[PDB]
Write a protein that binds this DNA or RNA. Sequence first.
RNA 1: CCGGCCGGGAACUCAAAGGAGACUGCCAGUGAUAAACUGGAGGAAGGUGGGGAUGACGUCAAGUCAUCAUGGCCCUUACGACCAGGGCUACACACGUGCUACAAUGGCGCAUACAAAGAGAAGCGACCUCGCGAGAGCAAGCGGACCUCAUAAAGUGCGUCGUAGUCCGGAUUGGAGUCUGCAACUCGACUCCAUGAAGUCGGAAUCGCUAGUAAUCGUGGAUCAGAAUGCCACGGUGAAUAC
RNA 2: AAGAACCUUACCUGGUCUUGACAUCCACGGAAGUUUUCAGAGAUGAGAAUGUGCCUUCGGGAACCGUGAGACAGGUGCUGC
Lengths: 127, 206, 151, 98, 115, 79, 101
Amino acid sequence: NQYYGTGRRKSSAARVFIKPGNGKIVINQRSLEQYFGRETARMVVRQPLELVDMVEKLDLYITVKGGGISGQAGAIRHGITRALMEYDESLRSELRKAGFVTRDARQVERKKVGLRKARRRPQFSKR
Amino acid sequence: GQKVHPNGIRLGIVKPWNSTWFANTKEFADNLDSDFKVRQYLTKELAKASVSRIVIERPAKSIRVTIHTARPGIVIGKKGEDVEKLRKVVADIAGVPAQINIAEVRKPELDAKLVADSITSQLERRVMFRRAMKRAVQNAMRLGAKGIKVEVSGRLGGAEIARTEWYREGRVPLHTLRADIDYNTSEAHTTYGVIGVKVWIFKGEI
Amino acid sequence: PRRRVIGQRKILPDPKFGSELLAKFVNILMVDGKKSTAESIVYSALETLAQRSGKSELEAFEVALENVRPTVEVKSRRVGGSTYQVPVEVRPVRRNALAMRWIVEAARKRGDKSMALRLANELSDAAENKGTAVKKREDVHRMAEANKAFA
Amino acid sequence: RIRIRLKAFDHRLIDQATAEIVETAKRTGAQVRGPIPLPTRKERFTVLISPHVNKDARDQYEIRTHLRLVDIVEPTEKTVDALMRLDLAAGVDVQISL
Amino acid sequence: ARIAGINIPDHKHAVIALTSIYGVGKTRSKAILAAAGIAEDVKISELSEGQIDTLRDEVAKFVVEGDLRREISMSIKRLMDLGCYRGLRHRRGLPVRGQRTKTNARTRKGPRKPI
Amino acid sequence: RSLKKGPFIDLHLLKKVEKAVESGDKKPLRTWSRRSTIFPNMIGLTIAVHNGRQHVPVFVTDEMVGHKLGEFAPTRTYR
Amino acid sequence: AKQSMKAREVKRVALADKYFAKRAELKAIISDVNAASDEDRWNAVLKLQTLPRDSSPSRQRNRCRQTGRPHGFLRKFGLSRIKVREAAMRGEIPGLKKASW
RNA sequence: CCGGCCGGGAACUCAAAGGAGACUGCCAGUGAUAAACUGGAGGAAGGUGGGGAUGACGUCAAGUCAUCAUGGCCCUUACGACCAGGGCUACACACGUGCUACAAUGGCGCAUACAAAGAGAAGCGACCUCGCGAGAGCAAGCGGACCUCAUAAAGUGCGUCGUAGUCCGGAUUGGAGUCUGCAACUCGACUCCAUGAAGUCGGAAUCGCUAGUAAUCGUGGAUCAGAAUGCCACGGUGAAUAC
RNA sequence: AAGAACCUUACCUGGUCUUGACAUCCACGGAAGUUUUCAGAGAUGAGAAUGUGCCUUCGGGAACCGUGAGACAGGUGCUGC
Ligand SMILES: [Mg+2]
Ligand SMILES: [Mg+2]
Ligand SMILES: [Mg+2]
Ligand SMILES: [Mg+2]
Ligand SMILES: [Mg+2]
Ligand SMILES: [Mg+2]
Ligand SMILES: [Mg+2]
Ligand SMILES: [Mg+2]
Ligand SMILES: [Mg+2]
Ligand SMILES: [Mg+2]
Ligand SMILES: [Mg+2]
Ligand SMILES: [Mg+2]
Ligand SMILES: [Mg+2]
Ligand SMILES: [Mg+2]
Ligand SMILES: [Mg+2]
Ligand SMILES: [Mg+2]
Ligand SMILES: [Mg+2]
Ligand SMILES: [Mg+2]
Ligand SMILES: [Mg+2]
Ligand SMILES: [Mg+2]
Ligand SMILES: [Mg+2]
Ligand SMILES: [Mg+2]
Ligand SMILES: [Mg+2]
Ligand SMILES: [Mg+2]
Ligand SMILES: [Mg+2]
Ligand SMILES: [Mg+2]
Ligand SMILES: [Mg+2]
Ligand SMILES: [Mg+2]
Ligand SMILES: [Mg+2]
Ligand SMILES: [Mg+2]
Ligand SMILES: [Mg+2]
Ligand SMILES: [Mg+2]
Ligand SMILES: [Mg+2]
Ligand SMILES: [Mg+2]
Ligand SMILES: [Mg+2]
Ligand SMILES: [Mg+2]
Ligand SMILES: [Mg+2]
Ligand SMILES: [Mg+2]
Ligand SMILES: [Mg+2]
Ligand SMILES: [Mg+2]
Ligand SMILES: [Mg+2]
Ligand SMILES: [Mg+2]
Ligand SMILES: [Mg+2]
Ligand SMILES: [Mg+2]
Ligand SMILES: [Mg+2]
Ligand SMILES: [Mg+2]
Ligand SMILES: [Mg+2]
Ligand SMILES: [Mg+2]
Ligand SMILES: [Mg+2]
Ligand SMILES: [Mg+2]
Ligand SMILES: [Mg+2]
Ligand SMILES: [Mg+2]
Ligand SMILES: [Mg+2]
Ligand SMILES: [Mg+2]
Ligand SMILES: [Mg+2]
Ligand SMILES: [Mg+2]
Ligand SMILES: [Mg+2]
Ligand SMILES: [Mg+2]
Ligand SMILES: [Mg+2]
Ligand SMILES: [Mg+2]
Ligand SMILES: [Mg+2]
Ligand SMILES: [Mg+2]
Ligand SMILES: [Mg+2]
Ligand SMILES: [Mg+2]
Ligand SMILES: [Mg+2]
Ligand SMILES: [Mg+2]
Ligand SMILES: [Mg+2]
Ligand SMILES: [Mg+2]
């Protein structure tokens, strides 16, 4: 009917819905081509749709807010892999072995007191 | 100095806040000053009455003060006369009404303020700092303690150079956050100078 | 690390040329974490390279990278007391990575006009081995060949 | 309707304050949505820890102000009077709004 | 390519050409070409002589070159004759707009000297 | 420079100048107000501005108008 | 921090609350772009100096209540950075535990 | 009327609470019949998962008598106390820590993308008008997941300059102003106009940094009438290398 | 120093004050206050009007103000050996 997965790579939080039909990928009422332009990788969202083939099988209605470009694009990758649960464990055997379902926790480290930014110490004067 | 205040690290976890009230950003600062004004006054007046801590609450313009003390008889006096004398003078400087309650403490040797103030009082009357310190350490272990560290910094015994000396007996884990530790300090103003008296008292594991 | 033998992070394939070799080249070329500007340059360079050479992009980049690739490089160890030049067989992971640095380092200099132009000209000279990157490998070989006495 | 909003510093004092005000309303005269949370305000402070020099060394503090809502959707006569003159719960600020 | 006192550039856009005039900058030059009715994208080589005469009367409105240089020289020389704080600052060769003079001020004070 | 709601002079200096000008030229006025501007009516007077430790006489000319009084009284001495 | 410096600050608070928390009309309302721009606006800034030098809230330094330290202040607590620390880890500022995130 | 606007909905993001969960627990091997460890399952996460707080006995007679307390010693028509200015902002010079540069992965225009964390009642101040712009009026709303400061900038997409002390740099000076504030000259910030300095990657030396780290682009807050390139936080793109 | 135009400000110049700006008293006279004028850089000094309250031992009060008197108040003065 209509399956769902979350995904929330780095502050950003995707919200992927997936249905069986056309090959198109809608996202925030925009097209995938125009929403993600020349930045680094458009096809990170389509990476999970390779081991399990899309072509003209599954249509994707997506919505995302938070982060920037790769934060959102990476969140959609996790969201799609989480969303691909209609064939429970048959897909996740091959999908996990190429990474993908790993959340990838790594958030920006806070600025430490005394340090100039997280790890960057100021300088050193020894006379 | 290099050690965190044992009370402060445990305020959210084990220990409670003494001043327990909410206030909006506008009032907060003035509300905190009147909180100090009574605390400073009430401690100096009730010196011989033997006060450990003062808990203050403020539900909808009404200052409920609570005096945790070892000797509850000296605070109330005769027929609760001194309570009414405190009620009046505290209410003026603070903020309109007053509700002074008095919680007794049957184990006065386990509260850190009382042991520190006892050691302070002894040091001012020319008692040997070791005879005051080790007697307080020995006294509370017999009753029901599991730790009791007692540090005394300063001149001590009219020395030229100042030394720091401590005697503990048992488990006093300052790094364990789950550990309930009564800590309190007091200054002994002698003829030679000031003498500090830090007291830790590990009571329970949780 | 003193006794902390841990493996390296995985990298990603570039969309238009899905591989790995040139994905690293983008990263070495990059400055100020601007992978968008850097990746646009490498495609612009390899498209202008493939036009001139008459090859693809991956095989054009390889027949170029191998010509600036070091077989042996020179370390300096002091075992006993004195300091001499000991050559050593470079590891295959670093081998091609050390080549990609010398291409980019040469392309910082040699101020033609654009970055895409400068890399394209550097890789074209690398294909016909007569650039600055091949000279930097050539000099590294001359140390290893001359200082071969030290094992 | 009466949107009741209340806030406090301790996270586990406000819970029984929100539980009691709901129970003295739900039981006495019906209707309640629930303890609607809202975001916690975390006013941070970064004071210098030493009395002189030593800029690197500081202590960092915060005061978590925990908000809560109630939200009733009918002006009941038993409930509206129970809210006034029957709150108590010290260290927990409350603001009824019609 | 000979308007006002000097202005002789070539192979340069009309907006950037007129920056070379003393007393005309980036924004002033756009106001010249807006009033004259000339595109900024063209260059002086591309322009005709019929269009250059309109630029001559347009820059004649603003105070430029030797007119401006004397206006600046007068205003600085005025301050020094008064003997005000700024005049003392000018003739002593030190920075005027309340600047730091201890570490920096190398632009106004000049390069480094011995002790 | 600041202030579009009237050029600023101290009440005391305004009244002291108005009293001095109507009477006639006399002597240097002791004034500590450096902040105060110079009006057209102040021309002719040799008012004495406080540099910090002493009073510096300043003969006011036609140019000394928009400028404030402290501009003609160097505070810090050097060489 | 000097009883004189603490005692001269109480004049600044008391005398400011008297005049300019009331007579800001002299500067705000009168010195304005309207019909009073002529001699009325001149008489405003003229009469604004007849007032004492103090009264201006900008002349209040805003120092710590307990000690009287000018620097290291915090408006939320009304205290110096030293006394707020001493009071925080002790139990006097409500809800002010040690932060770590 | 086509904007979560609308009834409405309780799935999802989120907000909070309170629970699950990662313990070398399972698996084989190396091991001393240990402790371990090396790989391997599953898992969102794997051997203290990342970061913080937490700082032993004591060292430097380390810093602080100027936060406060404080023993002595000192001053009392004064080293006490009120006021106007001036000074802490001086400038042959030397160093420390920054920032902005020296450009073409850049500069400049016109388009348009996607954040987080804050903060606000003598407060933050829309929207509309006046402004070339600082700002100036009118004033909506919000003690706030309601209102406001608040279009994030890098980044795309087109244009144009084509290696020049340059359309690089944006110093310095002159003029004209703006708000705050009794008051802006010593001695503020910002704006506009014109001006257009050194500088073409830096001698001996030398500093930080082991992944969302360095690097780079915004943003906020605290103190604060006004006055950050500092400090304290926040999130974008996002490396190299560790034999 | 989590932000020096005055303030801050501890420093300088000149003006100035000695129970003092801040405190409790022994007690002399007045409600407290508010509006407003003059000389002065301002601290200050000189006024001119109005108001004249909560309890009566009513020779007094509980506050506030300004005198004379001393217990004194005050010191970011030195000593972190
Ligand atoms: Mg750390
Ligand atoms: Mg720092
Ligand atoms: Mg960062
Ligand atoms: Mg050095
Ligand atoms: Mg250092
Ligand atoms: Mg050295
Ligand atoms: Mg210590
Ligand atoms: Mg010590
Ligand atoms: Mg510590
Ligand atoms: Mg530390
Ligand atoms: Mg310009
Ligand atoms: Mg500046
Ligand atoms: Mg200066
Ligand atoms: Mg001299
Ligand atoms: Mg003192
Ligand atoms: Mg105005
Ligand atoms: Mg101020
Ligand atoms: Mg959540
Ligand atoms: Mg085991
Ligand atoms: Mg075995
Ligand atoms: Mg076994
Ligand atoms: Mg494993
Ligand atoms: Mg595995
Ligand atoms: Mg291990
Ligand atoms: Mg663990
Ligand atoms: Mg860890
Ligand atoms: Mg530990
Ligand atoms: Mg030393
Ligand atoms: Mg010293
Ligand atoms: Mg002291
Ligand atoms: Mg000192
Ligand atoms: Mg003393
Ligand atoms: Mg003696
Ligand atoms: Mg003596
Ligand atoms: Mg300084
Ligand atoms: Mg300055
Ligand atoms: Mg230097
Ligand atoms: Mg730039
Ligand atoms: Mg927000
Ligand atoms: Mg808006
Ligand atoms: Mg606006
Ligand atoms: Mg608009
Ligand atoms: Mg406005
Ligand atoms: Mg908020
Ligand atoms: Mg809304
Ligand atoms: Mg802002
Ligand atoms: Mg661009
Ligand atoms: Mg742009
Ligand atoms: Mg160049
Ligand atoms: Mg040059
Ligand atoms: Mg420029
Ligand atoms: Mg130029
Ligand atoms: Mg460079
Ligand atoms: Mg170099
Ligand atoms: Mg070098
Ligand atoms: Mg060298
Ligand atoms: Mg180093
Ligand atoms: Mg490390
Ligand atoms: Mg930055
Ligand atoms: Mg900014
Ligand atoms: Mg702010
Ligand atoms: Mg800043
Ligand atoms: Mg002064
Ligand atoms: Mg003097
Ligand atoms: Mg001195
Ligand atoms: Mg010491
Ligand atoms: Mg010490
Ligand atoms: Mg020493």
